[PDB]
């Protein structure tokens, strides 16, 4: 719960939402939608997710 400046229409508050409110990997139509909240390309919004779920680390311990 980020408390400080207002931010609904913000380019990554929303990539945030639709990323775990939505799923994780969004497909095209989904990101299509972004791009105008973004003002992005379609392609450029990817870039942001791709980069996300690499950034963030999978829950649980890694053996084998």
């Given amino acids: 719960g980020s408390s400080g400046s207002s931010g609904?229409?913000?380019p990554n508050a929303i990539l945030e939402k639709?990323?775990?409110?939505?799923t994780?990997?969004?497909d095209e139509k989904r990101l299509e939608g972004?791009?105008?909240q973004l003002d992005?390309?379609?392609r450029s919004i990817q870039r942001w997710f791709?980069?996300?779920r690499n950034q963030e680390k999978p829950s649980g311990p890694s053996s084998g």
């Fill in 50 to 52: 791709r980069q996300r």
């Fill in 24 to 26: 994780k990997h969004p």
């Fill in 8 to 10: 609904t229409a913000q």
């Fill in 18 to 22: 639709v990323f775990t409110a939505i």
């Fill in 34 to 36: 972004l791009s105008k």
């Fill in 40 to 42: 992005w390309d379609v």
